[PDB]
Design a protein around this ligand. Sequence first.
Ligand SMILES: [Mn+2]
Ligand code: NA
Length: 286
Amino acid sequence: VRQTTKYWVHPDNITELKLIILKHLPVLVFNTNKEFEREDSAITSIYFDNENLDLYYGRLRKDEGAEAHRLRWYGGMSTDTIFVERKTHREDWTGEKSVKARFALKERHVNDFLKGKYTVDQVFAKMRKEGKKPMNEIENLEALASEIQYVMLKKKLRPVVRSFYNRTAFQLPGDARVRISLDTELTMVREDNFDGVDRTHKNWRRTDIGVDWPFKQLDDKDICRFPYAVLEVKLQTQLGQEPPEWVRELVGSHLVEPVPKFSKFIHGVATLLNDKVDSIPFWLPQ
Ligand SMILES: [Mn+2]
Ligand code: NA
């Protein structure tokens, strides 16, 4: 039985919270000399929606099967691998869950793929020729890309909001019973053209910013700098036990404020496009 919960952490409690967590878990690193640079912690996602904000309202209401679509990259602007991600809301007898699916795309193919000029077959031609990944897994990836490309074209999606943050991952590899992520420098940026300003110049992302937080070059109206860190806890507790004593104590501690349905996508749209949306998540006024 796996649970996921989200919390806001005041800047005054970030360090104290870090010290607690690191008592129990390692931090993941991705360079072999175990050294890291500022940009290594960067995660950037470009969320797509259409002008009616269909996907936003779907996610807000938690419609069954409501999709969010985002193009994400890790690290700095030299990163060439772009993950095309689809997150799907599920509900049934057992309760709720989130289903994530993605496939990887070279940056230079992104625009062409989103316009349906670069086909899914063309997208995976090199992967098939290689013969490294099993055929069925490839077929299932292709099916995902076709579904995503279809919705992007059918629903006329375009870039709407960017989320940026630095993420620390606390995790003892080979033990997913407990996984914790702390997100700082959380920022949402406008990518839409709803006020007539062609922010991306028809690219899939703005190019007038990189990962250079705090992004002082942005107009005030194009950016929301989030005051708190966001803590996410991913539990896999072996039935029928309870979560570890240190985890349960933490979440209930004054250090963190639970915000059940929090979503960077929803927060960004509602804050940045506040005059446009007709419904607002419940962590915001009305
Ligand atoms: Mn999350
Ligand atoms: Na490229």
